[PDB]
Amino acid sequence: VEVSQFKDAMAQLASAVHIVTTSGETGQHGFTASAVCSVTDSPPTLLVCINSNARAYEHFVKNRVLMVNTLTAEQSSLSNIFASPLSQEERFSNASWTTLTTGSPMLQDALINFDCEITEIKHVGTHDILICKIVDIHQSNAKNALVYRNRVYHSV
Amino acid sequence: VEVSQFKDAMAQLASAVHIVTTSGETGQHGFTASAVCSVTDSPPTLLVCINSNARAYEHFVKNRVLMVNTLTAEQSSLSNIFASPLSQEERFSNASWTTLTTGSPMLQDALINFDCEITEIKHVGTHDILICKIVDIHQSNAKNALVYRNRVYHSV
């Protein structure tokens, strides 16, 4: 199918919004993602799709850990910031961060935080699939989720 | 992490809802899925996670094509029907279906329809990842999406 048609069809597919981070000597690194889903509960595992040409990519390959920080309805600016060509220092300055187990930065006031080991990497052309065993979780209660659909944000 | 904690954390992660189908001599087969996301646009590709122990599974392995039918806000009963131990005949009787290119059943009145070839299969324990090249698309306009979060349905 044509790429434009696929992009317009994908614009219809509602998705949760996450900021996926990792830790480095280069310091903190992260990116906004929608292509995240659970895989299995034996053991709890999720996947994250990543552009293998992105600035982000080799930090994830090198470290082999990541945090999935699922965003609340109040964090749409942060979503945009982590999707845009800003330095990591500027990006991270816009929220508060800690760590769980891996050292990957945990976003404070997030909807959910899944700290993961990148167990394996599969190549799918311009993107890779990161298979991620979950090793620590923090969850919120009574918060609303950020959702992206029709190229705008929503509260669910 | 504990499975119960992971399930409760996943309950917070908003997701689109899809009915994933394929075609057979055994006839039509399908299942409700949330673990679906785009992968790449070179060429347009999505993935679908499937329980390799499910009744559904070997039909997908045998046929090597599937349709992702993304649901509208009006199709929550259909979502439940395709998640429950009903015969495929009973399931399919509850909507209208056609075909695009692969013969996988296309759900009428869906939000989006992605007809796919299952290019490769990766094993991740109890689940597999189906890598799916998109070969035909139908999209709706001006409809609302079904979203699942906190174990209940939503309109986005």
TrEMBL record, chains A, B:
The gene is ycdH. This is Possible flavin:NADH reductase. Pfam families: Flavin_Reduct (PF01613). One of its GO terms (biological process) is pyrimidine nucleobase catabolic process. One of its GO terms (molecular function) is riboflavin reductase (NADPH) activity. The keyword Oxidoreductase applies. It comes from the Bacteria. Residues 10-155 form the Flavin reductase like domain. Keywords: Oxidoreductase. The keyword Isomerase does not apply.
